[PDB]
Amino acid sequence: XXNXXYX
Amino acid sequence: XXNXXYX
Amino acid sequence: XXNXXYX
Amino acid sequence: XXNXXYX
Numbered sequence: 885x886x887n888x889x890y891x
Numbered sequence: 892x893x894n895x896x897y898x
Numbered sequence: 899x900x901n902x903x904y905x
Numbered sequence: 906x907x908n909x910x911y912x
């Protein structure tokens with residue numbers, strides 16, 4: 885919720 | 892991106 | 899109780 | 906989300 889990714 | 896929060 | 903998650 | 910509180 886505010887960071888990015890992608891996982 | 893797939894976890895939650897809130898920050 | 900006021901934060902989020904998910905655990 | 907699974908803990909309690911109260912905050």
Ligand SMILES: *[C@@H]1O[C@H](CO)[C@@H](O)[C@H](O)[C@H]1O[C@@H]1O[C@@H](C)[C@H](O)[C@@H](O)[C@H]1O
Nearest residue numbers: 885886893894895896897898902903904
């Ligand atoms: C996750 O939180 C953001 C930021 O507030 C919100 O815009 C999204 O709609 C929210 O996603 C929902 O809630 C999560 C907990 C559910 O897993 C997701 O499927 C979506 O309903």
Ligand SMILES: *[C@@H]1O[C@H](CO)[C@@H](O)[C@H](O)[C@H]1O[C@@H]1O[C@@H](C)[C@H](O)[C@@H](O)[C@H]1O
Nearest residue numbers: 885886887888889890891892893894895
């Ligand atoms: C972030 O990534 C998700 C895919 O997991 C995608 O659904 C969103 O549209 C994407 O957010 C955009 O790109 C990020 C980099 C920007 O900060 C956000 O404002 C939105 O434009």
Ligand SMILES: *[C@@H]1O[C@H](CO)[C@@H](O)[C@H](O)[C@H]1O[C@@H]1O[C@@H](C)[C@H](O)[C@@H](O)[C@H]1O
Nearest residue numbers: 885895896897901902903904905906907
């Ligand atoms: C969690 O909170 C976000 C941001 O406020 C909201 O967009 C989501 O819908 C909310 O998730 C719901 O409520 C929580 C309590 C549940 O664990 C989740 O699965 C979803 O129903």
Ligand SMILES: *[C@@H]1O[C@H](CO)[C@@H](O)[C@H](O)[C@H]1O[C@@H]1O[C@@H](C)[C@H](O)[C@@H](O)[C@H]1O
Nearest residue numbers: 899900901902906907908909910911912
């Ligand atoms: C909080 O959790 C305890 C232990 O399970 C339960 O006995 C209480 O009913 C529960 O409180 C409710 O749910 C929480 C989320 C609300 O903040 C509280 O006001 C009460 O409705």
Ligand SMILES: *[C@H]1C[C@](C)(N)[C@@H](O)[C@H](C)O1
Nearest residue numbers: 887888889890891892893
């Ligand atoms: C973001 C980019 C990635 C790491 N290559 C991909 O595997 C993931 C699903 O999305």
Ligand SMILES: *[C@H]1C[C@](C)(N)[C@@H](O)[C@H](C)O1
Nearest residue numbers: 896897898899900901902
């Ligand atoms: C999620 C709930 C929170 C941690 N209490 C709030 O400060 C944040 C902006 O959103």
Ligand SMILES: *[C@H]1C[C@](C)(N)[C@@H](O)[C@H](C)O1
Nearest residue numbers: 892893894895903904905
């Ligand atoms: C919230 C999202 C998560 C961390 N990917 C999931 O494992 C948990 C049960 O809910």
Ligand SMILES: *[C@H]1C[C@](C)(N)[C@@H](O)[C@H](C)O1
Nearest residue numbers: 899900908909910911912
């Ligand atoms: C839960 C109980 C508490 C710590 N006394 C209160 O201050 C909070 C608002 O709710």
Ligand SMILES: [Cl-]
Nearest residue numbers: 885887888892
């Ligand atoms: Cl994120």
Ligand SMILES: [Cl-]
Nearest residue numbers: 885892893894
């Ligand atoms: Cl996330």
Ligand SMILES: [Cl-]
Nearest residue numbers: 899901902906
């Ligand atoms: Cl919480």
Ligand SMILES: [Cl-]
Nearest residue numbers: 899906908909
């Ligand atoms: Cl909780």
